[PDB]
Amino acid sequence: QIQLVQSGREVKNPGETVKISCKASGYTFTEYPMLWVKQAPGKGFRWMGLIYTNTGEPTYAEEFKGRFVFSLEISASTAYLQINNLTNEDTATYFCVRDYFISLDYWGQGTTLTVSSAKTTAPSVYPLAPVCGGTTGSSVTLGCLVKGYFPEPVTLTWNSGSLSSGVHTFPALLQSGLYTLSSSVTVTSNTWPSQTITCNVAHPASSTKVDKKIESRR
Amino acid sequence: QIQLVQSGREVKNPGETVKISCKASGYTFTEYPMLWVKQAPGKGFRWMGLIYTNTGEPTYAEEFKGRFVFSLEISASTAYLQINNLTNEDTATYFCVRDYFISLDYWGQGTTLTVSSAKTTAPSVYPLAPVCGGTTGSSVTLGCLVKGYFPEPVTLTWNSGSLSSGVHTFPALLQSGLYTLSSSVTVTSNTWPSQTITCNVAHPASSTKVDKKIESRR
Amino acid sequence: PYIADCPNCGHSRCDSPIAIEEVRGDAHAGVIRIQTSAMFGLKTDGVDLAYMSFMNGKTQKSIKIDNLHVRTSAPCSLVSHHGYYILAQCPPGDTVTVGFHDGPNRHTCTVAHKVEFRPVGREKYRHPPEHGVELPCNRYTHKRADQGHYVEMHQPGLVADHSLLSIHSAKVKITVPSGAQVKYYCKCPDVREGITSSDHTTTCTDVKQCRAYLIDNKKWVYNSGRLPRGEGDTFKGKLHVPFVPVKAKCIATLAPEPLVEHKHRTLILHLHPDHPTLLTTRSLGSDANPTRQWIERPTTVNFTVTGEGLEYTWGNHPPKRVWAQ
Amino acid sequence: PYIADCPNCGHSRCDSPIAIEEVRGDAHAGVIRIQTSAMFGLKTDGVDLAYMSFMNGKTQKSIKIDNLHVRTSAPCSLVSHHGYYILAQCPPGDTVTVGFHDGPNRHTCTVAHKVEFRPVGREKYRHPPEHGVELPCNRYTHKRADQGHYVEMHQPGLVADHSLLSIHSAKVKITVPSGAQVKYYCKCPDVREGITSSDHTTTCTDVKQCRAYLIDNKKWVYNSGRLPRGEGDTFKGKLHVPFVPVKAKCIATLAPEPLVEHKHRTLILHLHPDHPTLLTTRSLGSDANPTRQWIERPTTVNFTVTGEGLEYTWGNHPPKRVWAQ
Amino acid sequence: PYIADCPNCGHSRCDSPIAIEEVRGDAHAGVIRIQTSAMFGLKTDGVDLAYMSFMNGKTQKSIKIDNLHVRTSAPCSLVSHHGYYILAQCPPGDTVTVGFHDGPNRHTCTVAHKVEFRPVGREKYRHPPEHGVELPCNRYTHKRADQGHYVEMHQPGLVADHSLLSIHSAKVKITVPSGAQVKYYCKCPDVREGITSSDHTTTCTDVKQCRAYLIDNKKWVYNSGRLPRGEGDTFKGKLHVPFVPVKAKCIATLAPEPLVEHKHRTLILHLHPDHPTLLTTRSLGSDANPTRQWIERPTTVNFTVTGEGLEYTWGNHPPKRVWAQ
Amino acid sequence: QAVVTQESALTTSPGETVTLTCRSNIGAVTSSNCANWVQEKPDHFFTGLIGDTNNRRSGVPARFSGSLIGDKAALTITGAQTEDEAIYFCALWYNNLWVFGGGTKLTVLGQPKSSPSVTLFPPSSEELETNKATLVCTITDFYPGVVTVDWKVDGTPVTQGMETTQPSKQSNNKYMASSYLTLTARAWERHSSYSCQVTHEGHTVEKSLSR
Amino acid sequence: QAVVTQESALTTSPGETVTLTCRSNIGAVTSSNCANWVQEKPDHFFTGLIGDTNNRRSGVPARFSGSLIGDKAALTITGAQTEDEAIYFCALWYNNLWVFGGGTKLTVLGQPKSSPSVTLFPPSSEELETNKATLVCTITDFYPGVVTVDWKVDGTPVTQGMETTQPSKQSNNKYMASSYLTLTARAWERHSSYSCQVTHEGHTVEKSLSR
Amino acid sequence: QAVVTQESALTTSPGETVTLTCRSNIGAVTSSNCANWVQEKPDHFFTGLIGDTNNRRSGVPARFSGSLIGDKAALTITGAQTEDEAIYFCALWYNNLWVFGGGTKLTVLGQPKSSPSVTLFPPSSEELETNKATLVCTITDFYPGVVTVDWKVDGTPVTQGMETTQPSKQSNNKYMASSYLTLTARAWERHSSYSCQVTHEGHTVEKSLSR
Questions:
Q1: How far apart are CA F92 and CA F102, in angstroms?
Q2: For F83, which of G15, G17, G78 is closest by C-beta distance?
């Protein structure tokens, strides 16, 4: 029914601008305006303002009057947050939210911004296959290591997303100035290596797409 | 909110008198009178009477008119049961109770009397440390054996009561004319014997207090 | 909470605990003070006026007031309860009709009583307005902290309870509430007083020829006409009345202003009230020559005013005065 | 449970199953016997008078009576139901206004009928009291074991049900309840009688030009004026009335006693009733010289009593007599 | 949903959101159009007329209408609500008495207003029947799509809210709803206007000597007499009325037919109405010689008919005519 | 001079609806008897549930409701839970005193089985200084609450000298018990292998010491 | 310019009734503050529970109800469930803006413990072609969510080179984490036995590779 | 001459709210269709839940409620339980007869897995007196209810002679099945090692006899 799906997470060096979209589904856009909330890493939840999706007038919280600008692609049921002249302390997650029932009833997924200086490094995608010997159980765990990229984000799927059950994707972590991510997938021992299992990785900032099929070590 | 906490359990030889206190907390004493109930070992629950904590008039059940006398330290929110010329068949547990809501809503913990002839023997407190060899697990169980006392009750705590989680205190049992009690405590293997663990035992009837630290056998 | 014989208790004469005596539609403010035989108020013991204790069985039932209904020609409005007694704002009604809802049953009680509500004033309304002048009405209080009168309330007499008179497998078997005093014998010769615990009956057998009585005088009652006397004595129990009639100034009536019209020593007055208004005058000569007439229909009237003066009283609107030279 | 056209069914003329016909405010005891077109009482099959079967759809709904409301100027009191018919103790009212609560909806029915309740007696009360003399009123029974009259109750005619006339994806599609007899054709030429299971319609297409009928005469009805005739026949179904008017002695009226005052061959009587009381006398000479006057306002009256005697009738209080030599 | 001062709000003068102004018992169809100060209808935002938004606190409460009750001498029947305004079919009543049930509380409001319902016609009924002739009554609509008039509805003035004026542990502490405009100072000298977020108060301490105000003019109101003026300006907010009085033909009255009886140039008429019926005639000579008399009591009357003719008007039954040669 | 009667024991499963009743020997139970329902959990732990027939004490789950069914007072547990396993007592008022029923032991399916935790301790040395030795075998956290404890000195089933307490209910609703084997300073020093064997829901646990 | 305050953390057991409160620094909370309650489950997953003090969002279980208790807004969970373990935030309206509370972390007894599923992968060969080798140790489905990961190259506790992420909550409410040990193509070829040891609720799991 | 349609299968988890619907091919379902809901548990066990659209049969938990949603009859299970896993059928009245829907198989998360209990019996001797031998392999109390049974005479997978029933639901909601391997008195006496291997939720259980 109601889905507010947000853009993916960006990386931006200080000074830049970002436009975060919120695409609304399930309601009539026009009778319910949008709340923009900032949940800062430590600090907790904060109201950034509200936009009248009918007239188009924004209210900003005083903390947010200035670099922040709400707007909407009415026509497509999108509300957008734009933060100009990005300050380093704006790294946090921003949620769109529907104001209804004397409060807020639905929240989006969040779009996380990491304001941070750094060039652009494409990831190296490495297959993780089991040890050279044996590996005999009722199931089997394969993996995919996405190493040394910048900035965030990368997306990772298994078999173009048709294999989602039994998957653990591990949050990217910064190490020596670069991000590293990994994912595991577990399937029955009959599936692999009988049927092909492929790691799909995209790094938008570098226009890098890598498809890596997990092959047996021998 | 409402707590009725009762005195501890006594031992008394036939013929004696006992005054059992009931200290009330959480309500205004004066608008709720007190029920005294006898739950005799086998027999089940029996109403002993009710005291008007406002006027002070007691009602006795006919079974209880005579040796039983209700009174109250109004001033301290205490109601008291006094059983004079104790008969041996008065061993049982007595509960105070609040009469409210067309019945009884809160019951106390109980004060158990054991009418029984016998002198006064102080307990011997023995530390129970694990076997001389090994004992390597994620946790460890120590113990404390309180042997050969009379009459009841004894109280037992661990580390002055600051260590209550993972404790099993075992009800006192009569053997060869004397009571014996024991307790175990289980802590992580890192706690002991690194940190001190001490058994605290009191026997009011003999004015005996013993603190026994559990020491390793070697 | 006393129980008596309601006269038209839904069907016919039941014995309701809320049996209505002493209806008093004698005040002015839309209010009636009533006595149920039931004593609502606090519980059996100590709490919350807004709970509800009537008699079910020999026993009380001290529970919530949830769905009281006093009513008349229309549903009334409760004002306050204290003791046996309730105050409620009612309209006029040929009768009075009372009742709560225990929850399983309606269980009401109803009675005849001529009710009216004249407000104090020369206006004969049917109901108090929102506005108008204040003036000294008669009315009952909201409150309980009240001693201005007290009615005798001594013991109950006995009551019937044939739930007692069971059968001892061939003999009729009486029991007792809590050790209460059961006054017993049968048409045959057996135990003749009955001041006992649970007795049997040696002689008679039929439940329908025995004395199922409850001398249970641990709590006094109101001295209803629908009470059987406690034959022993006038026990104590002088007990107040809450709802004293007091000299409240009701928010009260006012009739629309007149249309004064001049003529030669004569007041034409085209007049147009809201309700029947008692107009009256006093030609201030030693010849009084007064006039009185309730006016409800709009009417152009006349008054031969004299030289020295006349006065004019449009309802409880203040008295006017007039120089007609 | 028949369904007919209620006249002011909350909004306006609906078709309520409780459509009120034959209001009878003709007795004295505060009572009206009413016929709903709905047949409450036992269920469809066999149990419990105090359940509730009206028509919803073509279908019954034999469920609990939970929240019946007959009412008039004030809310009435139910007395008893049997069959289509309910007895209820009502006050006077210009109208009659009936209704239960199914639970999702109020679903009431209302009607005009001039109602009054004179009690039998020379007192013109508005309501029955708790006390007074008993005397022969007219009144309806509580009971059902009753045969004193019976009204014709033959079949229903058909009824409309356009829920039947669905569409067969291009043609209008009739169905049947349970194999019931559906009487069918359309303005166009197609099947002309209809005694069938679920038919289609070759010719016409529009639902609004077809005969959605239900000859469902497995259960007869009351012969309401708001019934369409079952054209075939006067089927059987002679069926009793429960609530016969009977010669009950109502608990009844009584006017306060007079104040007898002597004069020379003359009764002054300061008099002060509760309600309008028809007083009357008979000067026992062969010259009757009687008098009649309803008295509601307290009045000191006079009576030239003769030598031989007069009699005096203070309402349904018994007749007095007087020697005035 | 505006909130004003109800006059006899159960006990006495409360401030109910359903405070009744502009009672209009001026139509004929048993109907009254009322304005609550509460704006039921859609919710705060966008949905479902049949929901219920009154003011609780400074705040609305846009929830379900579950248990509305308009009533008078008897319980009325709702007709429709739109905006601040409700239409309801009522009987006559000296007063008007309104109220819903939030669920925790009755929370009603009541008022004085002279109500009657004459139907249009020479019959003076008390209530509309099921049958009779239709003729041009005055009546309000069911509907909302209505513009025939509009009443001014500009802003609210401020309102009190001493829930604001808390204490800052020694000083009296005002707060704000949502950043609304709180107009503030105390008897002492401190901040003198107040257009602020949550302020403190340096000078005064007592809550009872300060200006707890809410200039919250984000939504206009009805211009009730029980409103304090918004002193700044006549803001916009011209707003329609739904329930226009329209020329409906009420289902309407009819008096039972007369008994025509011949005599020599004379109509004896044994006559027997249902309700008070205004009869009247016109002797069609240039000598009119008409007659008028309300007839409620059955009466045999007479009419000296002339040679040329007379006409005869048995209530709103059509006019008859007669040759008496 | 009135006898309140209650079912003796009732067994139900988590999620079911169970009714306990309270019968008076003098007649039907009525609202003037102000039926009360009290629950006793292990450790002499009393709480009031319902009073005045149907008033639920505050903080008592709603799955509990009281009423009069026929001529008796009834307590219904709607959605019984594992936590409801306890003794329920009814009380009836009789114009001047209270009469308690015998109580109903209610058993509710739940609490997956749990094996005992057994520990055997050697006689401490301060105690061997008394010319006495007592081997303590502690057994805790077992459910169902029934065990068999058997001692074996040097391979031979001891049969005299031992004492085993009765299973006592812990707070978590599992049980505990301890067994004592008292020897003499001397019996102690004689034999060489002591062992406390605990049998619970079919598995055995043997804890042996070596002097 | 108003501060909403909430309990920091609350712990309950399945089946209990727990109350969270929301206090305003300016005064009592009233219906014109339109208290809202929002729940945050792991993964930045937000849902609204109650709005306008007591209006339950649609599809939010009935065990959740809001109200004003005293001078504060309260959320009561009646029959808390294991699934209710999350962060609850309250929001209050103040005439022109919203102020959010700090949130209350609620813990509910349930979800029986679950051991980790550990897998150690060898450096792939395409990566050994970069003159680099990274051993990945993945640990998933463990609860409680706390582990200790220790690496041991050739019998010797590595102590530099490793990086272990922070436990992240999976959907089923169990956790995951991975640890990396980066060597050089060369360090790789040198040593011979690698092992990733994971310690969880007392048991240890060692996954070793052999080059 | 009307067709009632229902969802084919629905899967939910304990604690969720699930809605089943019942559609009529002739038009919207209305209160004059008196929607009935019936539940079929294994063993041809029928109970009525709701009747006349929303009347709950007596002794049917309150988590079950019926209603009309849109133009169809609906059954909502509020707080589905493991015990609710069954087939739900709706029935609609059509003026003279009843039409039943195809039923909805509902699956509810719960009942932790349970391994099979396997037993292999030898041909009895009275049967070897008939010149026949039948090895019976019984498998009970397993869940999920799916198994693989493989027989192996003398080390060699038998492939002819065996018959395995279909898993049948026991009362506790677990399953059972038995497999038969019929030999001749003679085949019997020939070979020497018989074995019934049962594979269930990945573990294998082999029960062998020795003649």
A1: 12
A2: G15
- Token pair of F5 as six digits: 């009667």
Backbone phi and psi for residue C19, each to the nearest 5 degrees, phi listed first: -55, 125
Please tell me the distance from the alpha carbon of residue E172 to that of residue H76, in angstroms, as a whole number: 53
Identity of the residue in F58, F89, F119 whose CB atom sits nearest the CB atom of B45: F89
Give the count of beta carbons closer than 10 Å to the beta carbon of residue C5.
17
Which H or E run includes B189? Answer: none
Question: In sequence order, what E strands does E120-265 have?
Answer: 134-136, 139-140, 150-152, 166-167, 172-173, 238-240, 245-246, 249-251, 259-263
Long-range contacts of the stretch C275-278 (C-beta < 8 A, 24+): C275/C123, C275/C124, C275/C125, C275/C126, C276/C123, C276/C124, C277/C122, C277/C123, C277/C124, C277/C314, C277/C315, C278/C122, C278/C123, C278/C124, C278/C315
Residues in Cβ contact with C74 at an 8 Å cutoff, skipping those fewer than 6 apart: C90, C91, C93, D74, E71, E73, E74
**In this structure, how many other beta carbons lie within 10 angstroms of the beta carbon of residue A46?**
17
Q: State the burial class of residue G75 (Cβ atoms within 10 Å of its Cβ: 0-12, 13-18, 19+).
A: buried
Strands G168-169 and G162-164: unpaired
CB-based contacts of F121-124 (< 8 A; 24+ apart in sequence): F121/B128, F121/B129, F121/B130, F121/B143, F121/B145, F121/F209, F122/B131, F122/B132, F122/B217, F122/F194, F122/F209, F122/F211, F123/B126, F123/F183, F123/F188, F124/B126, F124/B127, F124/B128, F124/B129, F124/B145
Of H15, H17, H78, the CB nearest to G83: H15
Per the CB < 8 Å rule, is C114 touching D77? no
Determine contact, residues C190/C202, Cβ cutoff 8 Å.
yes
For residues E255 and E314, the answer to whether their CB atoms sit within 8 Å is: yes
Bridge partners, A18 (sequence order): A83
Residues in a beta bridge with H140: H117
CA angle A112, A115, A118 (to 5 degrees): 125
Let me know the angle formed at the C-alpha of A213 by A209 and A217, rounded to the nearest 5 degrees. 135
Cβ(D38)–Cβ(D18) under 8 Å? yes
Residue E318 preceded by cis peptide, ω within 30: no
Q: Taking CA atoms, what residue in C is nearest to B102?
A: C62
Q: Which long-range contacts (CB under 8 A, 24 or more apart) does C59-66 make?
A: C59/F30, C59/F31, C59/F32, C59/F33, C59/F95, C60/C1, C60/F32, C61/C102, C61/F31, C61/F32, C62/B102, C62/F52, C63/F52, C65/C40, C65/C100, C66/C100, C66/C101, C66/C103
Count CA atoms closer than 13 A to B31's CA, side-chain side: 11
Gap between the Cα atoms of E160 and E165, Å rounded? 10
Partners of F29 in the beta sheet?
Answer: none
What span, in angstroms and rounded, lies between the C-alpha atoms of C78 and C117? Answer: 16
Cβ separation A184–G47 shorter than 8 A:
no
Resolution, expressed in angstroms to one decimal: 7.5
Give C215's DSSP letter.
Answer: B
CA nearest E63 in A: which residue? Answer: A101
Q: Which residues are registered as beta bridge partners of C233?
A: none
| Residues contacting residue C42 through CB under 8 Å, at least 6 positions apart | C48, C49, C51, C53, C62
Residue of G92, G57, G63, G93 lying closest to G75 (CA atoms):
G63
Strand partners, C294: C278
E and B adjacent (3 or more CB pairs under 8 angstroms): no
CA–CA min distance H57, chain G (Å): 23
C-alpha–C-alpha distance, residues D273 and D297, integer Å:
7
B130's CB contacts (< 8 A; 6+ apart) are B140, B141, B142, B217, F119, F121
Q: Are E43 and E74 in contact (CB under 8 A)?
A: no
The C-alpha atoms of residue G17 and residue G80 are separated, in whole angstroms, by 6
Whether C216 and C156 have beta carbons less than 8 Å apart is answered as yes
